[PDB]
Design a protein around this ligand. Sequence first.
Ligand SMILES: N#Cc1ccc(COc2cccc(C3CCN(Cc4nc5ccc(C(=O)O)cc5n4C[C@@H]4CCO4)CC3)n2)c(F)c1
Length: 390
Amino acid sequence: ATVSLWETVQKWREYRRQCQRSLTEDPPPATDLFCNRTFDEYACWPDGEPGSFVNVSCPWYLPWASSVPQGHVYRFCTAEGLWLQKDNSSLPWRDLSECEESSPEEQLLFLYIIYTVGYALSFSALVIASAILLGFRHLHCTRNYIHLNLFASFILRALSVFIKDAALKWMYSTAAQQHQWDGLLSYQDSLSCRLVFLLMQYCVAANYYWLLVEGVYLYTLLAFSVFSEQWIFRLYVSIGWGVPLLFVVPWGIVKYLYEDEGCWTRNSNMNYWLIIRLPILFAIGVNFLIFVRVICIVVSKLKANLMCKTDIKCRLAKSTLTLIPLLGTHEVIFAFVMDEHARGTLRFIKLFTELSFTSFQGLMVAILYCFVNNEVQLEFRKSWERWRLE
Ligand SMILES: N#Cc1ccc(COc2cccc(C3CCN(Cc4nc5ccc(C(=O)O)cc5n4C[C@@H]4CCO4)CC3)n2)c(F)c1
């Protein structure tokens, strides 16, 4: 098992709840001058009769609570009925030496750096490429409208991750103490957190459905008779941008109705997460079938012509390498490797490694379909000649 500050704070909440109930349920002692019973962030202490110490068990929410189940934090209140103050009139004296004491926090922090750098390169390249394809009016096709909508989905996905990471400053808090935990929990069960999470989910799903729109349009070019060019464009834009909403708002409704705490992370017993994960896998699988059929087409067209025994393979390899980025073919591997029953730190480590590799899909697409594209080079030359004549 892997544990981090995540699981420690999540157990702290349950400890606090039980402690609050006990404090609110414990009858007061019959005697007087008793030392008042309070919950400090570190531990919960009961009432103590004056002139004696308190023998409390080591709190179970600590990661090292199982190493020594024999320690006892000690706090003393004098015979007058007040806790013993320590030096410089500070928090009352307590004995913490009984039970006290690379990591998952470090791993997650490095993956975040690689994924942020990749998304930031992808964002910049896709903005340049959208400028280039929208600018020139000779490059106005239907396939270039599909490409612009795909670029838009990539850019929205990158922009959503930055907001989620910047709104909850987890990287700075990776070493927070007990006091800092209260705040962390307060933001998690707020409404800003839940709606920022919902926005990120929508942007992920919309990107996936624009790599299926790409695939379905190429397939219909290679296997179908020409049909109305507006009745197909409206249908494609509708599928790309508004089919995600048919399973992202039902998920956001069930989560909002049937949950009190948390920022809508994966529930404990029930599995609501299938409302999002299941259509994503459907799109990924259909787009894999499209990939295989298109490559079969290229192989027959390549065998029919006259080439060597090796030039066939060279051109086939180059074409397959150039088509993995457009249809997102690697997501079939990355969905095979991912464990769908992991929760907490393990889930975050797995997710971040996939994001670390797949953050640079937008950069690959931008280079392959806008910077080395032959027509784009052609307009750069033609535009340059008109200025050089002047
Ligand atoms: N309580 C609390 C708490 C505890 C510790 C710390 C600081 O230390 C640690 C330690 C381990 C991991 C982390 C961060 C690692 C991840 N981020 C934020 C975050 N990105 C997510 C992406 C996808 C999903 C998903 O399920 O698909 C869910 C995602 N989540 C967690 C929830 C979801 C909204 O936020 C949250 C923390 N930070 C703290 F900042 C808060």
